[PDB]
Amino acid sequence: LSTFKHTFVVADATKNMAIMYASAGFYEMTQYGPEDVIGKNCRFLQGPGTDTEEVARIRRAIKNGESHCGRLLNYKKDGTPFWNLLTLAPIKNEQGAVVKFIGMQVEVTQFTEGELEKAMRP
């Protein structure tokens, strides 16, 4: 995991799951800037049609300190909908307390026959 490779955000469980850090990929993906992200909650990416039950699964997972993944619909700054494969993982300290969550986002795109050929024979 690198911040100049990958797309993720870090939430502070001690400051109410406010985002404390976002990677470059996240700003590129969503088109939002730091002023729209840092200190906020990523639920701002949700919008019309976002699945309520998936969002409830995310909420329950965070409440429980559990790892999680799920596809949900999100919205870029210009209002473009995209499918977000969101992976959540808790971060604990020494004591085994959840102090942060990391969230890793993948904008769904078509996986092609070409990419598959590449994958099995790099």
Contact (Cβ atoms closer than 8 angstroms) between residue 103 and residue 9: yes
Q: Is 41 in the site for ligand FMN (CB under 6 A)?
A: yes
Q: Which of 25, 68, 75, 86 binds ligand FMN (CB under 6 A)?
A: 86
Stretch 43-72: interaction string toward ligand FMN, x if CB under 6 A? x-xx--------x--xx--x---------x
Q: Measured between alpha carbons, how far is 61 from 85 in angstroms, rounded to an integer?
A: 15
> Is 93 annotated in some ligand binding site?
no
Contact (Cβ atoms closer than 8 angstroms) between residue 64 and residue 75: no
Q: Provide, rounded to whole angstroms, the least separation between the CB of residue 94 and ligand FMN.
A: 21
Q: How distant is the alpha carbon of residue 78 from its chain centre? A: 18
> Strand ranges (DSSP E) for 1-122?
8-12, 18-22, 68-75, 81-92, 98-107
Nearest C-alpha neighbor of 6 from the set 33, 20, 27? 27
> Is 105 annotated in some ligand binding site?
yes
Q: Is 18 in the site for ligand FMN (CB under 6 A)?
A: no
Q: Provide, rounded to whole angstroms, the least separation between the CB of residue 122 and ligand FMN.
A: 29
Residues that bind ligand FMN (CB under 6 A): 9, 11, 17, 41-43, 45-46, 55, 58-59, 62, 72, 74, 84, 86, 88, 101-103, 105
